[PDB]
Amino acid sequence: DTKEQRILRYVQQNAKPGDPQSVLEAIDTYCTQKEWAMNVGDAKGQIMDAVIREYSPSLVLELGAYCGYSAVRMARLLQPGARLLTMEINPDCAAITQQMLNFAGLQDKVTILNGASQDLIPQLKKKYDVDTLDMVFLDHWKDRYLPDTLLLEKCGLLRKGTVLLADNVIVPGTPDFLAYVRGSSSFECTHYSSYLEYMKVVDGLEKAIYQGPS
Numbered sequence: 001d002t003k004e005q006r007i008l009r010y011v012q013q014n015a016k017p018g019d020p021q022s023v024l025e026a027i028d029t030y031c032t033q034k035e036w037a038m039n040v041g042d043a044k045g046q047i048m049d050a051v052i053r054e055y056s057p058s059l060v061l062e063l064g065a066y067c068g069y070s071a072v073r074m075a076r077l078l079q080p081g082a083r084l085l086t087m088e089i090n091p092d093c094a095a096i097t098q099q100m101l102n103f104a105g106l107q108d109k110v111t112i113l114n115g116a117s118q119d120l121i122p123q124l125k126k127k128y129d130v131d132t133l134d135m136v137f138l139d140h141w142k143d144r145y146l147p148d149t150l151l152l153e154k155c156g157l158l159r160k161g162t163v164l165l166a167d168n169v170i171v172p173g174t175p176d177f178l179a180y181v182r183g184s185s186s187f188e189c190t191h192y193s194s195y196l197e198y199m200k201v202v203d204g205l206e207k208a209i210y211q212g213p214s
Ligand SMILES: Cc1ccn2c(-c3ccn[nH]3)c(C)nc2c1
Pocket: 063, 064, 065, 066, 087, 088, 089, 090, 093, 115, 116, 117, 118, 139, 140, 141, 144
């Protein structure tokens, strides 16, 4: 059995249906118990929650779903009517994320997209009826953070005030992405530090607010 399956099994046996907070806590507890390096975790979750509150997005794109922790984290804060679109390359992770959201009672707010971001991003405008995104959470493959930011721009999916929030920008690192957004007049950037256990290293998130085209 995969780590994802076991996490889901544990949630289903210990958390309360329709209680997103209970789901998040169960995931965090189980991974802490097993000493499994979490993808996100509650401290980084707090940063995400504050971003959501501050910009009040109605349409959010998540790149990378894994077991669904971040999808549950964001969807639970969205208003009625709001949508989260989450892209996941691995069908097994997509399946676990769907079940996790169902358990949390948040499935009504989320659409899971199966495939790679390079293939799915250009389909957002017509297949998924997206005009512009309010927020993007980048948590997929490090070497696509910059390409996908450029692709989002090219497809007309960003507008002034669209928030990009990128995880793991120090470890393993996305230095080209950081150099681009920090250097570009199209983005206003803020960094947030957070420690990773086991590797015992400071990592971080970058918030980059799009300003409009150059
Ligand atoms: C090249 C490449 C690698 C991974 N991904 C993902 C991903 C990472 C974790 N879950 N899903 C997505 C949505 N698009 C890509 C593209």
